[model samples]
Target: VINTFDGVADYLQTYHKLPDNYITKSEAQALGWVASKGNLADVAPGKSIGGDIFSNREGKLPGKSGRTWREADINYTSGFRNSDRILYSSDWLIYKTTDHYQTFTKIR
Candidate 1:
């Protein structure tokens, strides 16, 4: 156990020092679902964790899990857009990716 308050504070700082990028398989996979638009169906295999969903290269870095993802879109509305009928949801499904994208497999 930490002997002093300073030690505890150091531990907390170090823990947060960990990059928001590095992730485990479970963490990566779970975010895959969050990547979806309407739901899980909107997410797909090889879809990167960044970029505008409308673009074919939707999973590239410069578009990774940052403010960009929340603002990604095309053809209609991008980023946080609101309309008369309803508010278009963006930035709500930001997920991290190790490579550029990921793959999904169904469980039997």
Candidate 2:
């Protein structure tokens, strides 16, 4: 599964879920993933790194009681993480940020 912006966003919009290729950040780390090397694919073949608690500590993303927000990478192939990400919540709210967390847009 490709981790392009349009690909991931479209999947989320249509399926209301992330693709099957997602690998949690913690999960990948334990499996030998190195951020600087971007060895996600090397560690977990065909998997994209993501699906960890977003925390939303900055309060940049909208929040609600008991809603859990998670994050995933976008357009990442190798090297390092880009600014692009998909922030989604257990409440079914989806947001996208192309410039890291500098801004957010509700897309679902």
Candidate 3:
């Protein structure tokens, strides 16, 4: 459910599809659950809160499952774009899909 593109949440939440083997609603709901757990908002991670998961950098509690996405390594950077350009942030990746619980990857 970790989309690298910007503004993909709405699509995934509303229109994205899943494999033929699984229920569509269940697939979509699973993604929503992950987003809720990760505290990922309209904006991307890294660029916000300095990407420090253990430091409450994103205005959230540390060690929280939703603090980051398990799929970040394949998509969003540890850093992200500004109004005019891309910038490097810390390791606070919020788009990783490596696991559903504690297992995850670092983007920064």
Candidate 4:
């Protein structure tokens, strides 16, 4: 049901009331995940990398004092990562990037 940007936006809209499969980096680490390798199913079964605070140290996104951001992979094709990602915040900020965080587009 989620094959496009609109679907992702709708998913976020749904998250406003009910959460989804967003797990933390630490949680993933506990599940034997290593970012160095794109393996996420070995332990989590069907989870995506998420719930981790995305430090805006790159100064690319709008930052504030207490605004926290999280991220998830987009269009995961399995075997290897495709670099596409969806980033969002509790404050209703949503963004997408196809270039591995090199650039972003505000979706909502």
Candidate 5:
């Protein structure tokens, strides 16, 4: 369940992989899925588009060479995206950011 920060964090910490429900933005687009249209329930049923790279431009998250960051939405069965998100790194580190990117909570 990518429904909560803890859920996504635990899943990532445990499996080191996104759950079956996640797909990259391009993958979703290829499937005819549109963003913010709540159409994920249709074209890519049971799927959520994400894993787009998170640049950490706010300098709020830690970084290192080869430790790229990626982000995914939370509780996304919706109309428009909410502020909640889970950001994870290639190094298997996970963090939750509720204010988009202003702040983060470590989950790993």
Candidate 6:
């Protein structure tokens, strides 16, 4: 079983699925999510990582027709939030970033 953020991202891509712990940003927002507070668990039990549409405005990720980019918080085990993230797309492209969107490393 994978535990780290990168491993979990690969697992999701390979298995073509996500775990129960993951929730869409809108879903979390409905449960009273505040990015500055990081109080997701207080509202969404077992939901710490939230994902949403990530428009590649900077064109950092490789662009392709019909490819939609999505982003999820990474390595967020409660407490305050950080910049770590995992960017993935519909075409199975996965990337990891420890310093937020400043840079990324393709993993799949």
RMSD of each: 17.3, 2.0, 15.1, 2.6, 1.8, 2.1
Candidate 3 structure quality by residue, lDDT tens digits, 4-96: 334332223344321122222233344442333443223332222211123334432235453432211223333322221111112233332
Candidate 4's residue-wise lDDT over 4-102, tens digit each?
456666777675621355466788788787766868766676565555667778989898878888777766534455687878877878988899899
Model 4: lowest-lDDT 10 consecutive positions = 15-24
Query: Candidate 3: misplaced stretches above 4 Å?
Result: 5-95
Model 1: lowest-lDDT 10 consecutive positions = 80-89
Clashing pairs in 6: none
* Candidate 4: segments with Cα more than 4 A from true spot: 1-4, 17-19
lDDT of 1 by residue, 81-103 (tens): 22211001133322222222343
The TM-score that candidate 4 achieves is 0.76
Tens digit per residue, CA lDDT, model 6, 24-43: 87887787888788687688
Better of 3 and 5 by TM-score: 5
Cα lDDT, model 5, residue 68: 92
Instruction: Encode model 5's per-residue lDDT on 1-108: one tens digit a residue.
Output: 466777878888788878888988899888987776757768877777667998888778898888899998887875556788899999888888789678898878
Top-TM-score structure, candidate number: 5
Candidate 5 local Cα displacement, residue 46, angstroms: 1.6
Per-candidate TM equals 0.17, 0.82, 0.18, 0.76, 0.84, 0.84
lDDT of 2 by residue, 1-108 (tens): 758766776777678777988888888889998878867767888777777888889888877889898888888766666788888888767788988888999877
Q: Positional deviation of 67 in candidate 3, in angstroms?
A: 9.0
- How high is the lDDT of residue 98 in model 4? 90
Clash list (residue pairs), candidate 2 = none
Q: lDDT of each structure?
A: 0.28, 0.80, 0.28, 0.71, 0.81, 0.77
Q: Distance from true position, residue 23, model 4, in Å? A: 2.3
Q: Which ten residues in a row have the lowest lDDT in candidate 2?
A: 1-10
Model 1 regions more than 4 Å off: 1-91, 103-108
